[PDB]
Design a protein around this ligand. Structure first.
Ligand SMILES: O=C(O)CNC(=O)c1nc(Nc2ccc([N+](=O)O)cc2)ccc1O
Ligand SMILES: [Mn+2]
Length: 202
């Protein structure tokens, strides 16, 4: 496999994409996209929001999941039906039928935006996968291994592609390289990536 434990489902969300994007716009009308500030003081080039009971955010110079959007002081918007259903279909196809995400981080990449190499280790049970849905412009996803200096591999993620990051791949260092500018008929000029997470304690 390209990444042990990962299940790549190319175009899995292609048919759902128009509805997914409508729902991104609805979520963002309530909890707007914002460029968060990292613990080191840098404003991220990616802009994010969340839906579900919990949302991933900066708070007090750390990362955590919160039931309240610090920008609005209101709950994050509820998980849209289209999100819930797509995630469950993908996770079930990939062999995680009990995956029940309570958070969905919505990440908007403008041209030039990137995500530096990192791990997602803020979740309480790292045996639960993360389901990652790409929409719009294509991006190069890089990933290594469990160690920061493991050799990097790269793959293009295109509109509609879903990856279920389970098993070992759940813990790999990964990132997204600077987004090339272009046109997409449904997102116009950007990429969105949805990452579904089980963030609450059992
Ligand atoms: O776009 C894709 O294809 C994949 N997207 C992600 O892997 C993704 N991951 C996030 N995770 C973070 C965890 C820690 C962190 N840090 O410590 O600085 C920065 C980020 C946050 C948003 C994401 O869209
Ligand atoms: Mn990540």
């Amino acid at each position: 496999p390209l990444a042990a434990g990962a299940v790549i489902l190319r175009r899995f969300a292609f048919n759902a994409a128009e509805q997914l994007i409508r729902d991104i716009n609805d979520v963002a009308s309530q909890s707007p996209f914002r460029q968060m500030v990292t613990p080191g003081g840098y404003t991220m080039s990616v802009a994010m929001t969340n839906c579900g009971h919990l949302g991933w955010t900066t708070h007090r110079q750390g990362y955590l999941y919160s039931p309240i959007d610090p920008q609005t002081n209101k709950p994050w918007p509820a998980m849209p039906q289209s999100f819930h259903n797509l995630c469950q279909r993908a996770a079930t196809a990939a062999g995680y039928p009990d995956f029940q995400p309570d958070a969905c981080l919505i990440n908007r990449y403008a041209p030039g935006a990137k995500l530096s190499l990192h791990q997602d280790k803020d979740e309480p049970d790292l045996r639960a996968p993360i389901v990652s849905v790409s929409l719009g412009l294509p991006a190069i996803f890089q990933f290594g291994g469990l160690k920061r200096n493991d050799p990097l591999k790269r793959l293009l993620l295109e509109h509609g592609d879903v990856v279920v990051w389970g098993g070992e791949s759940r813990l790999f260092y990964h990132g997204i390289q600077p987004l090339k500018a272009g046109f997409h008929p449904l997102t116009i000029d950007c990429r969105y990536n949805l990452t579904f997470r089980q963030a609450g304690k059992k």
